[model samples]
Target: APDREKALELAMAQIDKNFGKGSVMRLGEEVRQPISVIPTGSISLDVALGIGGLPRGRVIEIYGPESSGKTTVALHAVANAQAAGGIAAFIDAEHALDPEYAKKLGVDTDSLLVSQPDTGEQALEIADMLVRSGALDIIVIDSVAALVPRAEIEGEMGDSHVGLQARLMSQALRKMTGALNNSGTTAIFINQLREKIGVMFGSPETTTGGKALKFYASVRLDVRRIETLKDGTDAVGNRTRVKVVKNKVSPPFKQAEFDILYGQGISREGSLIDMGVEHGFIRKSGSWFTYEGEQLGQGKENARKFLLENTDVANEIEKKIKEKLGIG
Candidate 1:
């Protein structure tokens, strides 16, 4: 084989010949841009998802059982992206998106271009078009489980066939990632979990697209309904036990709380009007409380203040999480 430099030169020359120098193609293997961290816009998950945030130019798979706050987190991301002055897009496959719900979450649904594709293929095509058009800062495909035929085969639950489908979808997903990543677009694919028993007594079962989807995802989160609070609100939870998870720019392997502010965004709870500090207040069924005051949840405003004031501590928290998680 040729030396590394020679081989790289030849590869770049061929790539440039096919796509030209101004395209995403790299000439002489010179990296033109530095990778940036994706701010989940939530402090805790930011730490949990690896210090800075979800890395741009990569794929994140958030999968969980029904009513596990998957959509809640997705909407939160959209809200964050929009807050950052970027256009957002959501590809709704189940036709289950509620614009009113998004409005309450502080996400500008009107600013977000949404697609309600009837089939999985159309969903992919829409995502491709949106990404290629370069008008979006972040794009979330509401659910991948709804994209395929026989997605829920009768009585065949917990089979490896689902893993096969995830792998196939990943092929197209990777291509989409390649296109979007080059354009500096962030993409997320929401997936559903299927219940399965553990292979051994000690190991727990999970719902997801097996190892293949795991590989394709730069970050993977499994959400579950851990408990229902006495206040009549559901305490949705997420756990990250996967091994290769980390931030590309800083420390990695951090596990922290995934939080939601109520009031405007209602999931498994009631809704309310905003108070002075209402942005940080999570509301449910006519009741609202601060993180320090009630529900063991941090006030959004308070948390943001703390994060801004304690950048070093936050970075340390990320380092500790990565150490504990054993991620590289």
Candidate 2:
């Protein structure tokens, strides 16, 4: 075989003549990075994803039980992208999206264009069109499980309608994958989980998104609520755990806790002290805390505040965190 450069040219020379120039590229040959990702809004979740966030123009599935903060993560991406001057759209197929709550999470409710389709097919169709058009930076679907197929919805309530939604979803996501390739869109699919029936033993919980979702999505998160933070007797937050089950664009199996303060969004600051201590950046000595022998005040909150104020230390700790998490 010829040398690497010559070999690429040899194949491209004939192919470019027939298919036009730049139709295809040799793997790892381009200087330009093809995949650029956007954060999922939670810093902890973002870091856990390993690519700093979900890759652009690829499908990402976020699944968890009810109230596991899936929408918060997806909505935060919408908020962050539009804040950066990128257009975004949401397919609220479930029709349960609260715009007021969305605004609380920093989404510009007025400018955020959203659609509420009656059937699952139309929702995916709209998503496919949006991605192919390449007019927006990100598009989020409220959920895959909430997507009830047209045929299923029209049938009798008790009638058995098997594999209807999944089959439709398979085609829709596969089609979106084509448009997703090398595009500037990040498709976030929010989904729900249900347990398999009649299983007498191990955990049978599974995401409603069947084979195709697992097949096409580049990043898939399995979120679980670990503990509830409380003030006195009132519940204040959910210390949720986010796990990256599949990451095709980067390293996989990274996990972290994303604490969501009720009124506020996902607060990485609350977990910053924990992460800092775990990664050996911050030390807890009795009632005192310090980083690199410099006092960061006392208590978890104060240490977190110090980390927030001290940008140099904060940045270094973040770098260390990513390094330890195996995020390149």
Candidate 3:
């Protein structure tokens, strides 16, 4: 036993000498570093994600029905990366990108790269190349549903091939995962959900593309419109719910709700009061708010201004909120 222990010690010493101390260690020998994340500019969503933001070096899938804010959320991540001085690329398979809206959301149009690919293969090829280049911080595919296979587009395949699209998506994502991991590039794939043709059990809706996306994606957010906000009759914005279906970076099934005001973009103040009340930062009694045993104001607007003015206090509260919500 002593001889075996001595041999093991000698092997470990050699490993440490070759790879440096702590580099050559067992699975649980050292604490793993937190995954690199890019904030999506929505505090509630970030907290719900449990990682404080979207993790880099992994595939993130966001899917929902039309007008569900999938594209908007993806653009938010792009804006975040740009804000952090990182380059971003957007592959518009549907060719529905609005540069003006993106710019309004803080995306740097001048430095951001945009591509319109006709087919899924071409889009994946472009994404693979960009990821391998290791120069971009984020690459967003505006939608996986709109991407048709080249064979389908070229009339090479008849309608008989049922699973060709799914197979192609699986292959593409399988190839891209390695590059994403090694290059530390975040890839967001926007997808659409379709109603099941015939189903009486389980979820009646499934995302387009295929199960390959479900398999490859480390984070999967299912966004849906909760309600439309209005100003006296004119539709002004939307209140959306983002559900974390599958989260490898944090806890799964956590949900967050936020609002997207038309022309104003995401309303951070909209959810501030709710978040504060939930976290006990501001006591809500009836219609008024009490902060630190003092009456602050009567509505969310005043609470928002209070938090904004007390930036340090707000930050501290946010830090605790992250910690309590399991957002690393």
Candidate 4:
């Protein structure tokens, strides 16, 4: 029966006094600002993410089957971060990292901090140390599924060691969730997906390392092979689909497609064409591309060169594309 408004004001004052001024902010005081991101150098993927690229100071999980271009995407991000004058680290738990491939991807091998920890525990410890040190801009764990606990390795050959990896992952993520956000370091965890035993209701596959990763990751991408690119009778590369499954920094379930040429890299021309078509900049007419009633080209390579040479129009197209994609 007392003054209700006065009572609410008194409660808020008490909260401010205890928690410090500005700690308990009003609803209007909270503004949704764009998160700082490291661009992955793939325009379509960056646009689909809606944050311009991978959000910094967060955990990102990229999972897929073997040869699905999961590692390629991760390396692309690392290359971008390094290109932006930031250092990066690669924690290779599987011991399958190839320096030559990384070099081909434009990753600076000399500047990158590469580590091969024997067990999952060691990898987590090393990652935590790096995050707290605040030296590197990004750190990649390639990958989560390959990490093995020291006990699992040292134990008997055939033993009932169920859920050991999951338990370790849970603990590691709990620590990482705090350290990563506060340290301003972007962490990329490459994961592998396993087909479920009998899943009839939902997705037939789930990523390894349990649900902790899915819960902690701000962005989750599922990479899969759409088809194999062929030159005549020989296989040249692969066409891949990158689906944004869980994106806290942007809208979820958006997808991007691209081609990866064997012994080369991601197809820039293919990505350009995809972006152009999606944004209405380029119109397709029976296998040919045109812009504003002008024939741009008939093939991917020609169209790419046309855009590259016409810098003014290409820049305008890029600007419009970014605006439409809500990239700021």
Candidate 5:
């Protein structure tokens, strides 16, 4: 339906404008170009990422249902970022973050600034502070759904209410993400998924929205709970799986298992080892033992080492979690 020649011309023009003709000419040059890296919270995740890190200066979205390990992964990222020698910040949108519980995750909260904004406007204000403060390496916004509520919702409508709220939230989220991105800060937006189920809906699906938020996210991950136990007792253990529902970077998107250990530092799980699989979202390496062997949790010196060796993202996260837990 489109003119092939015109499309080619437009594409070439874009390359020229964004990449520069000189840089484009050097595309096939023998020398490698500089690529920025974002450190995932775990070494195993980093390793599995193939790029050796998450992309720095970009927005990543992690969405899932309640207690599905979204916070756990985020806290772990903070710890890992600190381990890598960078500062991080977590913007508490839902007030779901527990200071003591965060400490149990092995993060150093002292250096991490926690902003408890009581309202959406206040939350944005706090976010501005974190960004303008210029002291952070990474900033995480937890649960966008909680932050944006419909100004008007009438009666017992199900789909219509959620649909309205979803649209509003997506727009606001994109604006915030753009603001943070402009500030040259790497950010992670954690979202809570509302499950959509019906015969017409096909399979049980996870969704936050279908527009702006979807388009704005550079990396979108859909985290969901998978049952491995018949009695469902594993839920108590924080066992869960992560799937890359929409990935612009890599190929794998199957559910990967991970443990959510509250009140303790990151550790290796025997089940993960026995399963003989690895999810690149944490640690890096595929081997559970190798990945677990590399964790150093909850000490000031270890936190320092973590920050120094890691990046802006790692440092900020570790400092905050540690401070919250009073873990030195």
Candidate 6:
């Protein structure tokens, strides 16, 4: 017993150094797990997630119908990571990245590493490299559904290639999932919703990449469009409802609602405004609004603008909101 215990001392140190500090421990002792988090961009969603944001060194899945603000939320997370002096990367499987809009939404495009891969295998290869290299703080694969395996692209039209992406995905995740959980890297996987044919009783919607992606993901959010916003026949944006369908870091089934205003992304200040109103720091009487014991303006946008211009008050209100929501 003494010799066996002595043998584990050095091996434990080796693994603990490679894997985060205090990671390798004897059985029955306390296990060292991740304690930090990266913001998901939406404050309501962040608090609803229970740990204040997406857990560091874990996989998160965001899937929804078209234009359900999936990419917007991912980009916002990238921007948040950069704001904290961390590096970020994007694996553009869909090849639909918009640089200008990302810039307008506060993403520093100059420093963000964006890769447009030709095949699904290539995309996962890049993702595996980035995750293994530990050179990125957060990485977004925009998207899983758009990943086309090389076999599908090269094979003849008659060849069956249905499980091509899922088979490739399982192996890649099997290799990288452990690597990611041990490092301080957060991986955001954006996927699309697909319908199952001949389903009549239950929900027919499903996500791509088979069950492997969902199994590896620590948190899974499903976004749905609540209402479409318009400004006189011009489609401005849409109200979004995000549901925490699966969560390993927190209680699942918690939901958050936010508006994805065009150009502004998920409406950060707008969420603050709603929070301020909900928590009573900002009062709403008739059409006029009051904040800090004084009238700010007659509209919610005014309160939002005030929060943007006044970071001090915003921080105060944000603290109270976070505290009330069981986060800090």
TM-score of each: 0.59, 0.78, 0.80, 0.81, 0.59, 0.82
Error of 1 at 136 (Å): 1.4
Q: What is the lDDT of residue 143 in candidate 1?
A: 72
Any runs in candidate 3 off by more than 4 Å, and if so which? 1-35, 158-163, 195-205, 231-233, 293-296, 301-320, 323-328
Tens digits of per-residue lDDT for model 5 on 233-294?
33235446666554334333434455444444333332223232233322523222222345
lDDT of 4 at 293: 77
lDDT of each: 0.55, 0.74, 0.78, 0.77, 0.53, 0.78
Alpha-carbon deviation at 253 in model 1, angstroms: 3.8
**lDDT tens digits, residues 1-328, model 4?**
4699689778878986885443343433322436568877677888777667888888998998778988888988898899889989999978787778888888998988989998778988898888888888899999776677777778742222453666677888898778887888999998876443445321112766546888888889989989998866677789889999887665577788888878666765567777888778889887698877788787766786788688777766677777665563
The model with the greatest TM-score is 6
Candidate 6 lDDT over 220-313, as tens digits, reads 9998889988756767788899999887665577899988887778877778777778788878897687877877677776776777788887
What's the CA error at residue 85 for candidate 1, in Å?
1.5
Runs off by more than 4 Å, candidate 5: 1-38, 41-44, 149-179, 195-210, 228-238, 249-255, 262-328
lDDT (Cα, tens digit) per residue for candidate 2, span 1-328:
5698698887878886786443454433322223356766555767666556677777888888778888888888888888878889999877788888889988999998889888778888987887778888889988777677777778633222453655777878777787877576888888777542445321112656455788677778888789998756778788888888876655567787867878787775656667778778878898698878788898776776787678787777777776675352
* Candidate 5, residue 301: how far the Cα is off, in Å: 28
Clash totals, every prediction: 6, 1, 0, 0, 50, 0
RMSD of 4: 6.3
lDDT (tens digit, per residue) of candidate 1 on 128-189? 88888877778888776666533433333343354335554666676787777686777787
Model 3, residue 197: C-alpha shift (Å)? 11
